Every structure is written in C-alpha cells, then in structure tokens.
Design a protein around this motif. Structure first.
Motif, short mmCIF file in Angstrom:
data_model
loop_
_atom_site.label_atom_id
_atom_site.label_comp_id
_atom_site.label_asym_id
_atom_site.label_seq_id
_atom_site.Cartn_x
_atom_site.Cartn_y
_atom_site.Cartn_z
N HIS A 180 -2.89 4.98 -1.12
CA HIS A 180 -4.25 5.25 -0.66
C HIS A 180 -4.27 6.45 0.29
O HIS A 180 -3.25 6.78 0.88
CB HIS A 180 -4.87 4.00 -0.01
CG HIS A 180 -4.42 3.75 1.40
ND1 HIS A 180 -4.98 4.40 2.48
CD2 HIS A 180 -3.48 2.92 1.91
CE1 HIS A 180 -4.40 3.98 3.59
NE2 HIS A 180 -3.49 3.08 3.27
N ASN A 228 0.81 -1.23 0.00
CA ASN A 228 0.00 0.00 0.00
C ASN A 228 0.84 1.28 0.00
O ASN A 228 0.30 2.39 -0.04
CB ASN A 228 -0.92 0.05 1.22
CG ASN A 228 -1.81 -1.17 1.35
OD1 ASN A 228 -1.70 -2.12 0.58
ND2 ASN A 228 -2.70 -1.15 2.34
N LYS A 285 -6.79 -2.71 -2.29
CA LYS A 285 -7.41 -2.45 -3.60
C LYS A 285 -7.01 -1.10 -4.18
O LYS A 285 -6.30 -1.05 -5.18
CB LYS A 285 -8.95 -2.56 -3.49
CG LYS A 285 -9.75 -2.27 -4.77
CD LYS A 285 -9.28 -3.08 -5.99
CE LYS A 285 -9.41 -4.59 -5.80
NZ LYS A 285 -10.81 -5.06 -5.60
N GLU A 286 -7.44 -0.02 -3.54
CA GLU A 286 -7.19 1.34 -4.06
C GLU A 286 -5.71 1.70 -4.16
O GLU A 286 -5.30 2.36 -5.11
CB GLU A 286 -7.95 2.41 -3.26
CG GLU A 286 -7.74 2.42 -1.75
CD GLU A 286 -8.21 3.71 -1.10
OE1 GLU A 286 -7.96 4.80 -1.67
OE2 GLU A 286 -8.81 3.65 0.00
N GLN A 312 -4.03 -0.11 -7.19
CA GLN A 312 -4.64 0.61 -8.32
C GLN A 312 -3.98 1.97 -8.50
O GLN A 312 -3.62 2.36 -9.62
CB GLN A 312 -6.15 0.82 -8.10
CG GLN A 312 -6.99 -0.46 -8.09
CD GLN A 312 -7.33 -0.99 -9.46
OE1 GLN A 312 -7.00 -0.39 -10.49
NE2 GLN A 312 -8.02 -2.13 -9.49
N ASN A 313 -3.79 2.68 -7.39
CA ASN A 313 -3.03 3.93 -7.35
C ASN A 313 -1.51 3.69 -7.45
O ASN A 313 -0.74 4.39 -6.79
CB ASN A 313 -3.34 4.72 -6.05
CG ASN A 313 -4.75 5.27 -6.00
OD1 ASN A 313 -5.32 5.64 -7.02
ND2 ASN A 313 -5.33 5.33 -4.79
N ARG A 314 -1.08 2.71 -8.24
CA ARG A 314 0.36 2.42 -8.43
C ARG A 314 1.16 3.63 -8.82
O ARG A 314 0.60 4.57 -9.32
CB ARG A 314 0.58 1.31 -9.46
CG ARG A 314 0.57 1.73 -10.93
CD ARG A 314 -0.83 2.07 -11.43
NE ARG A 314 -0.83 2.89 -12.66
CZ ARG A 314 -1.06 4.22 -12.75
NH1 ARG A 314 -1.34 4.98 -11.69
NH2 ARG A 314 -1.00 4.80 -13.95
#
Ligand SMILES: CC(=O)N[C@@H]1[C@@H](O)[C@H](O[C@@H]2O[C@H](CO)[C@H](O)[C@H](O[C@]3(C(=O)O)C[C@H](O)[C@@H](NC(=O)CO)[C@H]([C@H](O)[C@H](O)CO)O3)[C@H]2O)[C@@H](CO)O[C@H]1O
Ligand SMILES: CC(=O)N[C@@H]1[C@@H](O)[C@H](O[C@@H]2O[C@H](CO)[C@H](O)[C@H](O[C@]3(C(=O)O)C[C@H](O)[C@@H](NC(=O)CO)[C@H]([C@H](O)[C@H](O)CO)O3)[C@H]2O)[C@@H](CO)O[C@H]1O
Ligand SMILES: CC(=O)N[C@@H]1[C@@H](O)[C@H](O[C@@H]2O[C@H](CO)[C@H](O)[C@H](O[C@]3(C(=O)O)C[C@H](O)[C@@H](NC(=O)CO)[C@H]([C@H](O)[C@H](O)CO)O3)[C@H]2O)[C@@H](CO)O[C@H]1O
Ligand SMILES: *[C@@H]1O[C@H](CO)[C@@H](O[C@@H]2O[C@H](CO)[C@@H](O[C@@H]3O[C@H](CO)[C@@H](O)[C@H](O)[C@@H]3O)[C@H](O)[C@H]2NC(C)=O)[C@H](O)[C@H]1NC(C)=O
Ligand SMILES: *[C@@H]1O[C@H](CO)[C@@H](O[C@@H]2O[C@H](CO)[C@@H](O[C@@H]3O[C@H](CO)[C@@H](O)[C@H](O)[C@@H]3O)[C@H](O)[C@H]2NC(C)=O)[C@H](O)[C@H]1NC(C)=O
Ligand SMILES: *[C@@H]1O[C@H](CO)[C@@H](O[C@@H]2O[C@H](CO)[C@@H](O[C@@H]3O[C@H](CO)[C@@H](O)[C@H](O)[C@@H]3O)[C@H](O)[C@H]2NC(C)=O)[C@H](O)[C@H]1NC(C)=O
Ligand SMILES: *[C@@H]1O[C@H](CO)[C@@H](O)[C@H](O)[C@H]1NC(C)=O
Ligand SMILES: *[C@@H]1O[C@H](CO)[C@@H](O)[C@H](O)[C@H]1NC(C)=O
Ligand SMILES: *[C@@H]1O[C@H](CO)[C@@H](O)[C@H](O)[C@H]1NC(C)=O
Lengths: 170, 315, 315, 170, 315, 170
Positions: free
Chosen positions: F142, F129, F164-165, F168-170
C-alpha cells in the motif's frame, strides 16, 4: 534479553501460571484456557541446574594456619603473608563477581531464548493458517476448538487439514 | 480465534547483577557467598584434643597445665586463648615453626632418652611450676651443683635416635636472675653449653640478671629444639645453666591444628574452622573469616553475590 | 519441490563441558591440559653442565668430585640426586640462597686471592677427600701449626675486590672431633675467627667434639660466605680452626638451574623442565608437575579440559 | 543452543556431508542433491580458529626454583611457599575450567547461530515463492530445476521471476 | 513504497579484540590499562614529610642530616635516593623490618629514657658526624672511659616503658678500627654488652679492626633495636663499646611510606605512588609500575586492552 | 554477530545517521527521510554504560612496600616476593585479557541483537501489508505517506486500516 521475547514483544509474565515456566493461553468458542509447556520449562530448569551443579562442586584443597592470632609471628614473614593473602583475596573477589555476572547475563538470555524458541515452533506449526499479533499471540483464521488447541500444545496440529478455510479467511 | 505464548512471573522477585545491569529482578536466585557461621567446633567423627590451659609447645616439655597431654593422639588439635607453653618464664626458639609441626603431627608419643646423672642434683624446682608444691617441667631435668655454690663438673650426654622416624629433642638454657644466683645453683665461673648432631652445631652462654617478674621469677629459661634424624646422635656438653631433656617426642600421624574460642560440639560435622567456630557450606565463596582453615569456601570481600536461578521477572 | 538446510555430523563425537551441561558431544575438540612428558632433558641449542656427583655449592670450594667444574660456563645447569657439595663433612651457611645465586649465574670463574703464609703449614689433608691419596678442597687451604701441638700465630689476611663485579668469598670453621685433636692441629687455647668487610661482621669459635661419622670423620667444617662488592675488602683474622679461601668466584652471566633425574638429549629442543624431564607444549595448561621451571604452561589440578572445536554433534 | 537450529528445529545432522559444516539438500523433478555452503562453513571455522589462536599463545614469563627436592629448605619459608603455591594452583585450576566452559558454551551457540543465519538468508531469498516446513526445509511452490536450485545456493535466485506461478500455487 | 532499518557508522573506527577475532573495528572504544604517569608526588590534602638526605632509620638515632625530623608527623612519608641513615658508618640489624614499621607509623615522638652517668664520659664524637664541629648521633650517647686507656666500670641501665604504647629502643655496638683504639676509648680487656627485656635476651662483643673507610672511618657502629611492650623493662649491662640510647621513640598513628624520585606537588590529589610519580586513574588496570603502592589499579603486562563501547563498524 | 543483522543481512551502516545508533530510512511519493529510533539507541547505550560502570568501580584495597629499590632486601625473602609477584602479575594479565574479550564479544552481540529486535518489531507491525526485501528493508504494498511512515516510527501504525489494498496489491 538478547532475543527480545521476555520483557520484549511479550509485554509481561503470568503470575497465574504456577504449573511451569512457559505456557499457552488460548481463546476459542468454548472460552479461555491456560496450560504449561513441559519441554521448554524442563530445558530451562535443566540448564540452570547444570550451572548450580558446577558452582556447589567443592574443591578438596586443604589449607593450614600460616600465622597466629594469639601470638604474632615474626614481622618479616608476617608482612609477606599479609601481602600475599590480600592479593589472593582480591583475585577471588574479582573472580567471584565476574563469574556471577556472566552466569546471570547468560541465564537471563537462555531463558529469553527458550521463550523465543517455543513461540517460533508454534509459528512454523501454524503454517499460513494464522499470523503474528505482535504481543506473542497467534490470531488463528480458522475456528480451533479445545481439541484443535490441544493438538497445537501436544505438537500434532495438521496445517493442511484446516488450510483451505484459514487462507480463505485471509 | 487465538493462541498466546507466555511465561510465569511473581510479584516478589529477587534482585541480581549482570555484566550489563545492576539490580535486575529475576523469579528466583541463590546466594553464592556463605555468611552463616556455626558458633561451635563441630567435631563429629574426629578425635579431638582441646588443649585449654596447655600451650601446644608445652606438651613437649610438660609444665603442670600440660600433665594430661604429654602423650596425646588427635586428628583435630584445638589451641585456646588461655594456653600457656611455660611455667618458669621463657620462650621457645623458632616457636611458630614448631607449632606448625605439632599442629599437623597427629599428636606425640614420648620415649626416655636414658640420661642418668652422678655428681650433680637433678631436682631443681620453682614455685612458678606448681603441683603438690614447687616443681618443674615434667619432661626435663633441672641439673644443679650438689651443694650451694658447689663445683658443677663438666659433663657430656649423648642420645642416638634408633627409631625410623625423627625425634623431637628439646633443651633449655637457664638465665639466672643474678650472678649470685648463677654461682649458687651451678658454682662460679663461665658457663658454656654446646649442642651438636651430625648436621647441627650451636653454643650457648647464660646472661644472668633481673628480667621483669613473670610467675614470680626474674630469671628465664629459653628452650631450643631440633629434629634428630634416624641414626643421628645429639650430644649435650655443659657445666651448668642447662635444662636437660628426660624424654624425646615422636610424631604420631596427621592432624589439623586450629585456634578457636568456640565450644566443642560432637554432634555437628564440619571441615572448615576459624576463631569463631565452623563454616558448614556447599557454596564456593565465604565472607566470614579470611583465615579459616581446613576445607573451606574461598574468602571474598563481598557480603553477597546472588546467582540467578530464573528468568527476568516481569509482573 | 523442496530445498532443505542442514549441518554435518559424525558417529564418533567428543565429549566436552559447558557452563550449562557436563559431557555434551561435539564434532571435534582439542585438549588444553598437557599430559605428555618427554623423559629427557631436551638441551638442543643450550650450553649445559651436567653436575653429576658434584654438588652445585661444591663448585665453589672443590671437593674431588667437582675438579672438572671449578670454572664452568652454562646456560642450563643440571643438579643431580647423587650430587654432594662436600668431602670432609659439614654444611654451607644459608645454603639454598647460595644455590639460587649459582643456578642463575651462567657459571663461575675463579681468581687467586693472593694469600701466602709463613709460620704455619698450608697442607692439611684428610682421607674424606681423595685424589691420589688423602687431600682437601681444591680452592681452600687447611692451615695448621708447623708442628703437632705447636703455637698457631695470630694472623690477618685481607683481599680487596678490584673487579667491577661482586666476588663470592667462602671460608670454613673447623670443628675438631675432640679437644685433643684441636690442640694438636692448632695448639692449645681458645680459637677465635673474625671476618669483616665494610658492611659484614661476624665472629666464630669452634665447638670441638665427636659428631657421628660421615666419610669417616667425627669433626665438621662449616662454610660461610659473602658477596664482596667492587672495591670492598674482606679481612680474616684467626689463630687456627680456620679454612682459608685460596681463590674467589665471579659469576659469568645468566642461566637456568634445574634438578632432574632425566637423561640429557641434545636432539630435542625445550624450555620447561622438571625432575622427570621436559614439557614440550603449546597448550596453556599442564598437569605433569606443579614445580616445573623455565617457560611453562600453568599447572592445574585437572587431568583434562577439552576445548570444543565444532558444533554440537547430532547423529 | 540459544538459536534452536542445531539439535532444535533441524532434527539431526548429515554424516554424508563431508564437504563442509553447513549445506543444502534439494529435491526436484531431476532427483536429489546435497552441496556444502562455503561462506557459513568458513565463518564458523574462522571464529573457532580465532579461539584456538588466543589459547595456544604462550607467555614468555620465566619461573625459577624457589624450593629444593633433594634437600628440604628451611620450614618457615617452606610453609609460606607451599601455601602460596597451593593458592595459585587453585586460582589457575578455577581460571582454566571457567575459560573452557564459557568458550564451549559460546562455540556451540555460535555454530547454532551460523546454521540459523543461513536458514534465514534462504527464507528471505524465497520471498513468498515458498514456505517453511518446520524441519529446516523450504517447500517451493513453483517447480525449481537443478539450475534454479544452484541459483539459490550461489545466492542469485530471482524471486519476482517465479512469483506468479508460486503464489497461484498457494 | 519502502521503509528500511539500519544503524550508524563512522569512517574512523577503533580496533578491539574479542574471543573470536583480533582487531575487529567498532564505532567507539575505551582503554582499560592506564599508561599515563604524573611525574610528581601529588600530595593535596596530605601531611607529607620529604626526608631528603635523612634516611628513615636515621630519624630514630639522629645523624646531623636528620636533625629536622627527630619528631615528625605525617600521613605520607617519602624516602629519597640520597637518604642516609648513618653518619659514623654501620648498619641497623633487621633494617627493612624497621623501615616497614616506620613507613606506616604516622611519624614518631621522642621521650627521654632518664639515663645519667658517673665514672665515664658521655661526649664521644667523630668528624663523620658534623654539626659546628665533630659531633655524634643526637639521640644516643657515646660512652667512654674518663681518660685515655682508663678503666670503664661495669654498668647497668634500665628503662621501664610506662606508656600504653610500645617504645622503640635502639642501641649500638662500637667496633673500633683497632685493638689499640678500643683499649684507648674503653680501657683494655674483653668488652661484653648484654641486653634483655622480659622476652628478649642477647649478648654482644666488639670485633675491633680496620674496615674500609666510610666517611673517613675504619670502625663501625652497628645498631640493634626492640619494641618494648607497655610495663616491660629493657636492661643494658656493659663495660664499654656501647652506644646508649638517650631517648626512646613512640609511633604516632598511621601513614603510607613511599620511595620516589618525583617532585612534590601540593596541587594535585592522588592515592597511588611509585618511583616515577603518581598514577591518577579510574581504570582497573595499569602498565606503569608493578611495585606501585597505595590504592592502585592492578598491574598487567599488556600495553593496551581496548574495551568496546559501540557496535561493529561497517562503512 | 550472533544475530546476523549488523554486518549481515544489513550490508553496511549509515555515516549520515548522527542522531542515534539505530534508525529508519523511508521512501514514498514525497521522497526520502532518515530518522533515529530513541528506544533501541538508549537500550544499547545503557547496556554499555552498565559495563563501564562495573569496570571503573575502584577497589579500596591498599598495598604497602614489601621490598626496597634503594637497598636490596635479604635474598631468601626477596626470591619468594619476586616469585609471588610474578605469579600474581600473570593472573591479573590473564584476567584482564579474558574480561575484555568476553565483554567485547557480548557488546558486539548485544548491539547486533538490538538491531535485530527493532527490525523484527517493524515486521510484526506491518502484518501482511509488506514483505521483507532482504537488505533490512520492508517493501510496503500500500502507499504510505510521511504521516503513515511516522506512524510506524512512533509505533502506532494500524495494520487493519491499510490491509485491504496492500494484500490486493500482492
Ligand atoms: C620484686 C622482685 O623482683 N623480687 C625478686 C624475687 O622474686 C627474687 O626471688 C625469687 O622470688 C620467687 C617468687 O617471686 C621465688 O621465691 C624464688 O625462689 C625460688 C623459686 O621458687 O623459684 C626458690 C627455689 O628453691 C629455687 N630453686 C633452686 O634453687 C633449685 O631448685 C629457685 C631458683 O633459685 C630460681 O627460680 C632460679 O631463677 O627460686 C626467688 O628466688 C629475687 C632473687 O632473684 O630477686 C627479687 O628482686
Ligand atoms: C668409630 C669412630 O667413631 N672412630 C673415630 C675415628 O674415625 C677418628 O679418627 C679418624 O678416623 C678417620 C677415618 O675414619 C681418619 O683416619 C682420621 O685421620 C685423619 C684423616 O684422614 O682425616 C688423618 C689426617 O692425617 C689428619 N690430618 C691432619 O692432621 C692434618 O692434615 C686428619 C685430621 O686430624 C682430622 O680429619 C680432623 O678432624 O685425620 C682420624 O682422625 C678418631 C679421632 O677423632 O675418633 C674415633 O672415635
Ligand atoms: C687511610 C686510612 O685508612 N686511614 C685510617 C684513619 O682514617 C684512622 O684514623 C681516623 O681517621 C678519621 C678521618 O679519616 C678521624 O680523624 C679519626 O679520628 C677521630 C674521629 O673524628 O673520628 C677523632 C676523635 O677525637 C675520636 N673520638 C674519640 O676518641 C672520642 O670522642 C674518634 C674515634 O677514635 C674513632 O672514630 C672511633 O673509631 O676518631 C681517626 O681515628 C686510623 C685509626 O683507625 O687508621 C688509619 O689507617
Ligand atoms: C598482618 O595482618 C594481620 C591481620 O590479619 C594483623 O593483625 C592484626 O593487627 C591489628 C593491629 O595490631 C589487631 O587489631 C588490634 O587489636 C588489639 C587487641 O585486640 C587492639 O588493641 C587494637 O585497637 C586493634 O584492634 C588485629 O586484632 C590483628 N588481627 C589478627 C587476625 O591477628 C598484623 O598486624 C599484620 N602483620 C604485620 C606485620 O603487619
Ligand atoms: C611443602 O610441600 C612439599 C611438596 O611440594 C613437601 O615435600 C614433600 O614432603 C613429603 C613428606 O615429607 C614427601 O613425601 C615423602 O617422601 C619420602 C621419601 O620419598 C617418604 O619416606 C614418605 O613416605 C613420603 O612419600 C614428598 O616427596 C615431598 N615432595 C617434594 C616435591 O619434595 C614439604 O614437606 C612441604 N614443606 C613443609 C614445610 O610442609
Ligand atoms: C627481585 O626482582 C627485582 C626486580 O623487581 C630485582 O631487582 C632488580 O635487579 C636488577 C639486577 O640487579 C636491577 O637492574 C640492574 O640495575 C643496575 C643499576 O641500575 C645495573 O648495574 C644493571 O645493569 C641492571 O640494570 C634492577 O634495577 C632491580 N630492580 C629493582 C626494581 O630494584 C631483584 O634482583 C630480584 N631479587 C632477587 C633476589 O632475585
Ligand atoms: C639405622 O641403622 C641400623 C643399623 O643396622 C639399620 O638397620 C637401619 O636400617 C638404619 N636406618 C636408616 C634409616 O638409615
Ligand atoms: C673502584 O676504585 C677505583 C679506584 O680508582 C675506580 O677506578 C673504580 O671506578 C671504582 N669502582 C667502583 C665500582 O666504585
Ligand atoms: C601497666 O602497669 C600499671 C600499674 O598500675 C597499670 O595501671 C597499667 O594498666 C598497666 N598497663 C598494661 C597495659 O598492662
């Protein structure tokens, strides 16, 4: 310890591991298994043995009687002897305590280090196919059977083989 | 699914100290300070002499309790608490220096100094030194006037050391228990003893009078000694109150001298000794006896210093 | 494509020891125990005295071999194996204490004590002390009866130290080789010498008789000494067998005294000396000579202790 | 070593690196190059020099003769001197050995540490644009020319510049 | 967005040394070498004796300056620079050995030795020892001929130690300032004093003559002593020039003896003392006085050794 | 330091952190906050206190006067005493210096280690994360509010919650 592996990110030891000093505990479809790592165990043992080797190495310096328990020697020399002996006893008592404290700090630190070095070797092996739990465990994304696990322990696991599915299994 | 890294442990760990923490528990540890004493003199592979009743200095002059040790060879010499150097009371001058010499001597061998006497008796004797009856120091001659109160002629005796090793030379000055006894043994008048070698010179006079009784005697015989170099000559000049050496002593080699209460044991091997026995150990330190001699661990004040031989123990 | 991290290495690495491993190889290492001896006395920047045939104690009394060192100044004093303190045989009382004093003295200066004599000769002499012919100690007076077997008058001589530093005062007691020689030199009868200062008192008597010959002589002259405090007075009272001081010695400053077999070398500089030369080193330890003096590395038993000055060597 | 870099995850040293103690070995389209890292090399050297500085620092304590090789002193004092001297020699021999062993352990460990610290600095620099081989090498996903490589060595490599293509080149 | 890890710091950090670096700055540090001296003798909870003008050896013989310390009990004994053992000039034989004994004695108690005298006076006196007028050592008897130049009869006095602890026995030999004075005090002829016990024997003769004046006197009284074992007997035999003990001394227990210039202070508590006061510290090392006694930190040459008690300081 | 955290990848310390030895500095939508970490601070303090405990522990060995400042003792014994005393002073001066140097090296290293151990604990917590900045900061993909940040500090942050977020926010 300086490396924070033993009594650190690894919560406790395994009393069941009677086969070595460091080891692997795995979980897969076929169940659970625990095996010792020879190289790390041997590295720590040999380091500690080297310390013992150094400490049990006797000096061949003889000492003779300088005073007498049955008939007290002259007091002028007697007082000097006693003063000198007490001073030497203080020196050796200090030396012994300091030696053992330093040796013990370093022995704990080298054992902690060896644990860390094994953990790190595995992490580098599992390039991207797994990630760190945080209690000294690697959660493997791809499925890894007993032979795949043995491949990790025997140090021949091929990362690029299982790469595809593992990263997909993000 | 998962592979986990870990380390061994035990429920029964051992406490040690570090620079940072007192009593941290580890999987295994070994003691570095020897506390185990063997209550014996372990003498396996050593030629020993157990002096018993014979005081080490006694070996040179030969009171009856030393008759079996007049010439002895040893590499381990054991002095005992009951040891006594003398029979007729008195003391050795510079006694501890001579003990240190004899302890490391490898033993002693004796040689006649060749003194013969005319005009005096040679057979002074005392109940303090008992063999079949009243006797004296085996290595010495108690010289007296031919008759009670008789004239003791001025005499001179010389001995040259013709060996390649130094000769241990002992003589005595007799302090009679009274003036009347002195005049009886040696005749009246001032007594003077002079002793010299190339580098040694000293004069002696008896102070007669009653000391407290030891072994029944109120007189005293005080012993003096020198190490006579090869080719040097000792000269004694005297008119009485003189205890002459009959034989000189020569050192044999090398030895360790110990003082011990412990019983000999020819079956165990050892190198470190003290009053209470033998310290047999490979540890660098010991807390048994700070005055132990031979090849010993170093004495330390602490009872225990545990060396960690494992990782931190986390059950 | 790729970037790699690494470290240097060499094929010819150096072994060292650690707490954990014996003989681990490292890229570089330096020795901490000095083994290099310079077979010279490196004396650059120091005022030296090479005593040679003159024994250090000889400087105070002046046998012929010390004529050139009766007053000397030095900050490095070298005693030599051939050094001899005496000419007529004998010894100094408390000799090593006096050597320790003279070694650190910075040298000595002499002053006449002002004694003059009537009723006795002053010119006692011996073939043991040779200059143009039979002679004696340059700083001393061999006092004798005016004629063979003549009366030696009871005498008293006193010297007050009026300097602000202590005076070294030496005197001798002559033990003749026979009673007949004593009576000839000094007249018959008992000889007594008494010496005192405010805090010192001692009496002396000769024991005449034949010692083994040294330098042709069977007599002996034994030397005694004291350090006489400022404003204190030494008194000698005697009737013969007395060797009187002519001059007193005063210490000059500070010095190091060494014993050495090694040749002087004014070109090299050094601070640590021993029998075999000079130890020139910045290392903390040395294994050359445990009795080295001056400013020295500490003596250790080990031949070598290599200090690692690089990383582990992995070829 | 405690850090497992030198004689650990880095298999061996480079005898060709004659320019420094630690360095970089790169492979790209334009070929191969090897360069020394100044800062890490200097850190290790300076640390070791500090140890030497401490050890060659002489004491100015004079000693004088207490006994005599030409004419033996009185035995009563002689025996005490000898006993005292032998005791002091034992102390210094012990001190010297312990000093050098501790210094040497730590010297090996600090040099190992410095290697590790440089490796780690690079890894943090190459945030996500590369991953760890395991023999002390970083496999760079994006193409990285001589100037990009120099940017890593001179410590100015911009991660977010080459981010896009590198992560795409997973 | 972001979470950052860090550590504390300060602008005013403290320098320390490590194996690798000199003068590295850390957040906090503590000194390990004590430099703080208390310029007092801190004696809280201790029985002290401040000897002042009384020399420690003086307590056994009793010159006027020691009249208040003839029997004393202490666990801390303080010798002072103005302390003097004597009144009539002279010295104690083996003086420092006796000081070491008295320093740790716990003090002394005295007992009469029971000597009474007929045929001689007992009241020898001198202006050097002043009370109401000319006086002498309180514990001693200056024995003289009944009249000027009178005969001093040959005498013998004996004392048996019937206590379970050793008795400290002191006697004096009087060296008159001239032969004429000796003959006046004691009658003409040779004076001889002999002293023995079961294990001790020594003879003494005065050497009369003028020493430099101390306390107005050109004579000297030199004091000798022995420790007489339980049930042993000391015998004195003499014909003059003898200073007899009236009382024997017995040791009381245990004490520490110090030499100090510092003023007593009963309010502070301490265990480590020296010339300049008391070292009160928990630090392992000290750089105040290498000869401090009691329970002390170890003396080191360095002024300061700072122990780091924080992380490296990075502002 | 051996771990390269303090005066290493962490550029400097915070003079404002007056609440502990190690701490957290966070940035989110609601602004900035700085808080101390108790456990790490206490670990370092307790380790150092253990060193102090060992050093202030007095010996109960008495010494008595062997010579005399008011009236000089006989020179034969005097010279031996002085030689012996000077030798013992050299030994203790050496011992003291070596002790303090070793203790100080290790004290700096253990404090550096403790900083490293806290940083590493956080990294393992933020599994995927977030990623490492390189100046001891974690860039969280995130969004993470004050309560999410407190969850990191109190050591209860749930990785799989915000997984998840973040990725996705790589
Ligand atoms: C209670 C008390 O103090 N009594 C002493 C007596 O002890 C002392 O007489 C001596 O007593 C001895 C045993 O106690 C012993 O009987 C002494 O006699 C001998 C001896 O055996 O030692 C007899 C020997 O024949 C004689 N030898 C020679 O004369 C030559 O060979 C020796 C010799 O005279 C002495 O040993 C030398 O000191 O003595 C006996 O003398 C008595 C006299 O001193 O005084 C009492 O007060
Ligand atoms: C083999 C043996 O032992 N021989 C000795 C003799 O050596 C000894 O006679 C002495 O021999 C000396 C050389 O060996 C020397 O000749 C002695 O004579 C002198 C001397 O030079 O020392 C001569 C001096 O004139 C004389 N001085 C004075 O009288 C006053 O100035 C001195 C002095 O008498 C002595 O030095 C003092 O001891 O002696 C010579 O005496 C012989 C006598 O002892 O005995 C033989 O057995
Ligand atoms: C300048 C110089 O050196 N002068 C000395 C004189 O000092 C010395 O005479 C002695 O001088 C003393 C004071 O300086 C004192 O007056 C000596 O007399 C006494 C004394 O008090 O000590 C008098 C006592 O009555 C006498 N006691 C007895 O006879 C028995 O109780 C003692 C005793 O004789 C001595 O103390 C023993 O040494 O002396 C006075 O003698 C003079 C003689 O030596 O010589 C001058 O050169
Ligand atoms: C130098 O140190 C030694 C110790 O190594 C001292 O010797 C010890 O002295 C004490 C006290 O005299 C002895 O203890 C006593 O023993 C006797 C008889 O057993 C008893 O009566 C007392 O109650 C007390 O227990 C001790 O045994 C003895 N130790 C040895 C090994 O001999 C010595 O006194 C010191 N020397 C000087 C000059 O201070
Ligand atoms: C105290 O220790 C010293 C050593 O520092 C002892 O001195 C040494 O004594 C030995 C034996 O006497 C000497 O060796 C011998 O040398 C002679 C002549 O060269 C030779 O005949 C023998 O075969 C043997 O090799 C040694 O040289 C000497 N060393 C020094 C430096 O003087 C001394 O004896 C000890 N003192 C006591 C009282 O034990
Ligand atoms: C053994 O070592 C001690 C030092 O512990 C030596 O004692 C010291 O000796 C010096 C020189 O004699 C004294 O210094 C001098 O003091 C006097 C009077 O204050 C002054 O006139 C001089 O200018 C100089 O300053 C020093 O005070 C003294 N120290 C102590 C503590 O007593 C001693 O000499 C050595 N013993 C031997 C035998 O070498
Ligand atoms: C002692 O004297 C004889 C005389 O010939 C000689 O052979 C021997 O070597 C001498 N020994 C020594 C040690 O001087
Ligand atoms: C020695 O005596 C004289 C006499 O006036 C005096 O000037 C000098 O200061 C005294 N010196 C000492 C050291 O007492
Ligand atoms: C001393 O002698 C008496 C005589 O009866 C005895 O009671 C006492 O125990 C003896 N003491 C010693 C220490 O020998």
């Amino acid at each position: 310890g300086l490396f924070g592996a033993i009594a650190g990110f690894i919560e406790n030891g395994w009393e069941g591991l009677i086969d070595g000093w460091y080891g692997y505990r795995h979980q897969n479809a076929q169940g659970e298994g625990t095996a010792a790592d020879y190289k790390s165990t041997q590295s720590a043992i040999n380091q500690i043995t080297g310390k013992l080797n150094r400490l049990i190495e006797k000096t061949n310096q003889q000492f003779e009687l300088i005073d007498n328990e049955f008939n007290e020697i002259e007091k002028q020399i007697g007082n000097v002897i006693n003063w000198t002996r007490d001073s030497i006893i203080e020196v050796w008592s200090y030396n012994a305590e300091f030696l053992v404290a330093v040796e013990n700090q370093h022995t704990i630190d080298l054992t902690d280090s060896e644990m860390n070095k094994l953990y790190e070797k595995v992490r580098r092996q599992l390039r991207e196919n797994a990630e760190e739990d945080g209690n000294g465990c690697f959660e493997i994304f791809h499925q890894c059977d007993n032979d795949c696990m043995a491949s990790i322990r025997n140090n021949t696991y091929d990362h690029k083989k299982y790469r595809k599915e593992a990263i997909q299994n993000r | 699914d998962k592979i986990c890294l870990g380390h061994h442990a035990v429920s029964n760990g051992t406490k040690v100290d570090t620079l940072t923490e007192k009593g941290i528990e580890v999987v295994n540890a070994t003691e570095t300070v020897e506390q185990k004493n063997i209550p014996k003199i372990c003498s396996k592979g050593k030629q020993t002499i157990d002096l018993g009743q014979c005081g080490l200095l006694g070996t040179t002059i030969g009171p009856p309790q030393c008759d079996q040790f007049l010439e002895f060879s040893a590499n381990l010499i054991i002095e005992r608490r009951e040891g006594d150097d003398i029979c007729y009371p008195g003391k050795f001058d510079n006694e501890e220096t001579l003990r240190k010499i004899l302890r490391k001597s490898g033993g002693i061998k004796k040689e006649n100094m060749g003194f013969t006497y005319t005009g005096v008796r040679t057979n002074g004797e005392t109940s303090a030194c008992r063999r079949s009856r009243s006797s004296f120091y085996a290595e010495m001659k108690w010289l007296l006037s031919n008759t009670d109160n008789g004239v003791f002629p001025q005499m001179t005796k010389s001995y040259k050391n013709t060996k390649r090793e130094p000769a241990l030379i002992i003589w005595g000055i007799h302090h009679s228990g009274s003036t009347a006894e002195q005049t009886r043994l040696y005749g009246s008048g001032n007594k003077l003893i002079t002793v010299w070698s190339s580098k040694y010179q000293q004069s002696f006079a008896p102070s007669p009078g009653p000391r407290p009784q030891i072994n029944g005697q109120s007189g005293r015989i005080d012993f003096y000694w020198l190490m006579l170099d090869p080719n040097d000559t000792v000269t004694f000049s005297f008119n009485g109150a003189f205890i002459a050496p009959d034989r000189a002593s020569f050192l044999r080699g090398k030895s360790l001298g110990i003082q011990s209460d412990a019983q000999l044991d020819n079956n165990c091997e050892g190198e470190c000794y003290h009053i209470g026995g033998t310290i047999i150990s490979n540890l660098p330190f010991q807390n048994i006896n700070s005055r132990a001699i031979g090849k010993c661990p170093r004495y330390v004040k602490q009872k225990s210093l545990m060396l960690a031989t494992g990782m931190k123990n986390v059950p």
